[PDB]
Structures are given as structure tokens and as C-alpha cells.
Design a protein around this ligand. Sequence first.
Ligand SMILES: [Zn+2]
Length: 45
Amino acid sequence: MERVYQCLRCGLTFRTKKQLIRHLVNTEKVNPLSIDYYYQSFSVS
Ligand SMILES: [Zn+2]
């Protein structure tokens, strides 16, 4: 029961934004100020 965040590139979902952002930056070359388009917040039980 938490809100996870997936990268809109690989579809990879993380349980924390830290894992999300570091992956957005690392693989999808997305800078943290531009993450809003490449990450989506979804709540899962
Ligand atoms: Zn990705």
C-alpha cells in the first residue's frame, strides 16, 4: 500500500523517488528539473 513511480521510458517502477530520479538521470538522461514528464506517480496496494 504505497505510491510508486515509474519511468515513462522503460516502464520501471520504484517504491521511492530516489531510485526513480537516479534512474531517470542515469539511463533516460533526464535531469531532476525535467523529471515531471518522464516519471508517473501511481498508488498500488
Ligand atoms: Zn527507465
